[PDB]
Amino acid sequence: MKLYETAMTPSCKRVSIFLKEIGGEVERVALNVREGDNLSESFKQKSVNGKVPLLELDDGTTICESVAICRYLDEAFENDLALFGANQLERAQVEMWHRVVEFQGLYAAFQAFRNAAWGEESKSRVLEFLPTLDTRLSESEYIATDQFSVVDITGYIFIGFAVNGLSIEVFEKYPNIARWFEQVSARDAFQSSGLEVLFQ
Amino acid sequence: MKLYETAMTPSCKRVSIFLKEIGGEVERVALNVREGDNLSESFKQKSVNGKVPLLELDDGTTICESVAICRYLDEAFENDLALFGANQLERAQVEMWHRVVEFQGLYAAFQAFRNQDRENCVAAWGEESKSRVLEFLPTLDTRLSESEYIATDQFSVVDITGYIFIGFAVNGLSIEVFEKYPNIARWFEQVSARDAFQSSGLEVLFQ
């Protein structure tokens, strides 16, 4: 299999960090950037959502969506990190908190970043979610469960959006997010994630 | 366990259809509708997202988000439907197509139905959201010309979500989907005939 990606974009970094966490290695194929994760006119039919990252299997089957690629790669490389949840309850809690972080945090941050009235509304929803996330991190070491999971990769990208893309002073105002972020950003798999340049 | 729900709302019907498919039974607790779409009352802190449906386990743990509730129930009631996918590839394709249908279809249909755009008011965002629904429908129709179901060749949770999405488009947004997209129509005729979808309230779900 091979992973099609652009050089420095949040969607692709979600998969890159996941792969480093589980100790997997997948051949990369670099693509040109189009506009909004987009693929070229001649390359877009390979991707159902029309975007990178794109995982291509040996017979030509392609999987798009960063989380879908991560799920496939989780089963491709034996590992003990259980990033989608170690037991039945954790698997449901991971699903719950992943969708909460994605809808209330990541997607709103994306909308606010690329944008004026909807971008401002999207930014307000980000600001309203941060106290909810901070309160959660005051009573749980990680977002979804007591252990590091894929939700923490997604949350890290979301907070990276908020601080480095939207100029929100998250860490000044929310010490529990800051505690968790300091912890997660120290993990080996997050090094050279491009955080400092990812949201320029 | 207990499932907290309101009487006739799409998010709760997503769980109800799934539970019927896998042959599970869970005690239901009716709640009042609080508008704001699916929002809970002053008891909302038991729900991380503040909405119904809400699953409460025997030990008091609560799980919100319809798909997360379905994932737990799938393991709680052993079944051979493999609604999340039967093997590694199917599980990834389910995840891929579920997210495509949810973002590009269902979520946009919700926003158009309930309606905040680039230098605009709330009405223009609803019109923009409706245009996104219309742009995704050809992609779904082309998929259903090559696959019997949305995510794979087998019925999966994505087809439950697609059914709710197309219900939104036709019965909520007055889009003549079936006239223009015969493969969606074929698939919808097939899925809407399943026993678990009977009495889903389709005719009244989007009033």
Residue numbers in the entry:
A (entry chain B): 1 to 115, 128 to 212
B (entry chain A): 1 to 115, 121 to 212
Question: What did the published study say regarding this structure?
Answer:
The crystal of VpGSTT2 had a monoclinic unit cell with space group P1211, and the diffraction data of VpGSTT2-GTS were scaled and refined at a resolution of 1.92 Å. The electron density was clear for residue H2O-300 for monomer A and H2O-107 for monomer B. In the apo-VpGSTT2, a loop containing residues 36–39 moved towards the G-site cavity, causing steric hindrance to GSH binding.
We identified a novel GST in the genome of the shrimp pathogen V. parahaemolyticus FIM- S1708+, a bacterial strain associated with Acute Hepatopancreatic Necrosis Disease (AHPND)/Early Mortality Syndrome (EMS) in cultured shrimp.
